[PDB]
Design a protein around this ligand. Structure first.
Ligand code: HEC
Ligand code: HEC
Ligand code: HEC
Ligand code: HEC
Ligand SMILES: [Co+2]
Ligand SMILES: [Co+2]
Ligand SMILES: [Co+2]
Lengths: 106, 106, 106, 106
């Protein structure tokens, strides 16, 4: 999917996680975030189009998704074992990763 | 120093970094925040003084300073590279982690 | 490429790095290793193939490539700074992470 | 405690974890490792004695304990859950962090 749609998927499912009651909903929302992040890994953002696909900026772009994916993965571990509030607090910290990439590249 | 002094250190040195002119000034303030974060790591915040030190809430509290310290290290690494403005942007992003802990435990 | 071929790309490029004489060779090789690692991410290894894709085992498998990719990125960071010796030593240390996953899933 | 005594604690408790047989054993050994890495953070290694305490080298040194403490804390999360196999696998991957710092600064 394109970068914009993966970003909507990330945004929509963070909202799902915030308002969720129960493990299964959080787990499904995180699984979809992980898939959208993995898909977005390979995109070139509008503001880096004139940069070489191996420039530091493009490396650091992919590095932001690497951080995000690890955080999603860890939240998924918590959700998978029923720790819903812990998973939600993990999701609130990973918002900071969204913000840091957005400040540099959005 | 106690937890309240550490937080004032963190807060004050965010302002120092924002208005700094050169890499040495950023590096010194970040060093002070790394020390105040490492010191707060072992504190018990008032809202958790009725939980056990070996409790999921205290482990999360401690984990929060570990996150903050890694982000402070990343910003120092930029300062050690002479990248003043980048280190300053990274110091600004710390606020998201400050807030994420405060939401839970302040 | 399949997992086999990703694994063989990782093996070959470690040698490339080991015998490299400039930063551009090391960067190149580390970039191909990052690529193959990301490709190996989504694979299912034989020894887990009668296992649920949601199992702790398959989560751990994926986590192992997340670890590897992070170390490769750190080695790339050093290569971008022209630190051929540091980047080579970091590359050589990747073998511990290679070996650690092999011990579990091979 | 001195750096040697902390490394002895780290080393001895790795071995206990590899040969442990109940949860509390792993948890207690990890808890001790957590403490020893915390203490060691603030030390100066012999090969870095004639370097500025705020040089990149001493910063990288401290950062290596930051990585190690993070990994110990994730292993401890598993142990505190009853996931002892898990946690022992996490223990094996920590060795790579030991080795990487040793190669550089021991
Ligand atoms: C990141 C850089 C920051 C900054 C700038 C601040 N904090 Fe914290 N903080 C935490 C707790 C539990 C408290 C309550 C302390 C108490 O009531 O005793 C605070 C408080 C503060 C303050 C107010 C201090 C006061 O005297 O009332 C300020 C100005 C402040 N902080 C700044 C806990 C945490 C964290 C736990 C993991 C983290 C991380 C931060 N705070 C981060 C920051
Ligand atoms: C990870 C779990 C480990 C383990 C099991 C050990 N270390 Fe370290 N280590 C570091 C340095 C600078 C030294 C030399 C200290 C000196 O010269 O005084 C060591 C040494 C050791 C030893 C040998 C102790 C002896 O006196 O012979 C042992 C058994 C040992 N270590 C175990 C530095 C670091 C780190 C810095 C970031 C990290 C992390 C580790 N070591 C990790 C571990
Ligand atoms: C880089 C490493 C990023 C991370 C991590 C996250 N986002 Fe992002 N996002 C990024 C870019 C470069 C852009 C601009 C894309 C474009 O085509 O202009 C975006 C955009 C968004 C948007 C707006 C999408 C749109 O319709 O234009 C949203 C809603 C968004 N991102 C959300 C989001 C969330 C919730 C994230 C963490 C969970 C996140 N993004 C991470 C780059 C990066
Ligand atoms: C798990 C997270 C792994 C990491 C990290 C690395 N490897 Fe790997 N490797 C893994 C598996 C499950 C296998 C078995 C593949 C199979 O289909 O049986 C392998 C295999 C290899 C091989 C042999 C290739 C072959 O066709 O048999 C090699 C040379 C190899 N692996 C090397 C290697 C290197 C150099 C790595 C990192 C730099 C590395 N592996 C990481 C799982 C995982
Ligand atoms: Co579209
Ligand atoms: Co492929
Ligand atoms: Co768990």
């Amino acid at each position: 999917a394109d970068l914009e749609d993966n970003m909507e998927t990330l945004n929509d499912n963070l909202k799902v996680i915030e308002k969720a009651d129960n493990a299964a909903q959080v787990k499904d929302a995180l699984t979809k975030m992980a898939a959208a992040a993995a898909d977005a890994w390979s995109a070139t953002p509008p503001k880096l189009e004139d940069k070489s696909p191996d420039s530091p900026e493009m490396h650091d772009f992919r590095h932001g998704f690497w951080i995000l994916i690890g955080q999603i993965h860890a939240a998924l571990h918590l959700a998978n074992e029923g720790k819903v509030k812990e998973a939600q607090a993990a999701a609130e910290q990973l918002k900071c990763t969204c913000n840091a990439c957005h400040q540099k590249y959005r």
